[PDB]
Paper text:
After five synthetic steps, a single purification was carried out to give full‐length human lysozyme polypeptide 20 in good yield (36 % based on the starting peptide segment 12). The full‐length polypeptide had an observed mass 14 700.72±0.03 Da (average isotope composition) and calculated mass 14 700.63 Da (average isotope composition). The purities of the full‐length lysozyme polypeptide products obtained from convergent synthesis and the one‐pot sequential reactions were similar [Figure 4 D, (a,b)] although the overall yield was slightly reduced. Finally, the full‐length polypeptide 20 was folded with concomitant formation of disulfide bonds in buffer containing a redox system consisting of 5 mm oxidized glutathione, 2 mm DTT in presence of 0.8 m Gu⋅HCl and 1 mm EDTA in 0.1 m TRIS buffer (pH 8) to furnish folded lysozyme protein 22 after HPLC purification in 38 % yield of isolated product (based on the amount of lysozyme polypeptide 20). The earlier retention‐time shift compared with the unfolded lysozyme molecule in reverse‐phase HPLC and the altered charge distribution in the ESI‐MS, characteristics of a folded globular protein, was clearly evident for our chemically synthesized lysozyme molecule. The lysozyme crystals were obtained by mixing 2 μL of a solution containing 14 mg mL−1 of folded synthetic human lysozyme 22 in 120 mm LiCl, 2.5 mm HEPES, pH 7.5, and 2 μL of reservoir solution consisting of 30 mm sodium phosphate, 2.5 m NaCl, pH 4.9 using hanging drop vapor diffusion method. The crystallographic model was finally refined using Phenix. The refined model had an Rwork/Rfree of 16.2 %/19.6 %. The obtained 3D model revealed correct disulfide formation and had a C‐α root mean square deviation (RMSD) of 0.132 Å compared with the crystal structure reported for recombinant lysozyme protein at a similar resolution.
Author numbering: 1 to 130
Write the structure that this text describes.
């Protein structure tokens, strides 16, 4: 599914994302916007290294989920990458939380550094009741 902005903001808030490891809801929203356009079915194959990015947060198969086809990959979220293509985002949120428990935090996603870091991100949550 493709979420609408404020729908997604409240969904993430109910799933415990606001302030998770210091990361505001607006930052999670900015991440989802630029990774996938709020689309849980989004996929991107990286021909350069044979990995794939899955779901609303575009979480990568080399480290975080198992798809069976990424060489030498691990599965730190202990999930099939299929779980990251569901309309319900609970599993994707649990995995994103795992990602940011690592040293880099939200910086794990280059798109966040490019599109969200040191920016005014208020617009992503304005009017949503969060
Ligand atoms: Cl939690
Ligand atoms: Cl916020
Ligand atoms: Cl595995
Ligand atoms: Cl699996
Ligand atoms: Cl920062
Ligand atoms: Cl509001
Ligand atoms: Na599992
Ligand atoms: Na960290």
């Amino acid at each position: 599914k493709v979420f609408e902005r404020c729908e997604l903001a409240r969904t993430l808030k109910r799933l415990g994302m606001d302030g998770y490891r210091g990361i505001s809801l607006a930052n999670w929203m900015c991440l989802a916007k630029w990774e996938s356009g709020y689309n849980t079915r989004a996929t991107n194959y990286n021909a350069g290294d044979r990995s794939t990015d899955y779901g609303i947060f575009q979480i990568n198969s080399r480290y975080w989920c198992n798809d069976g086809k990424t060489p030498g990959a691990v599965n730190a979220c202990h999930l099939s990458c299929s779980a990251l293509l569901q309309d319900n985002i609970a599993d994707a949120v649990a995995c994103a939380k795992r990602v940011v428990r690592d040293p880099q935090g939200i910086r794990a996603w280059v798109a966040w550094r490019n599109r969200c870091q040191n920016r005014d991100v208020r617009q992503y949550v304005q009017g949503c009741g969060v």
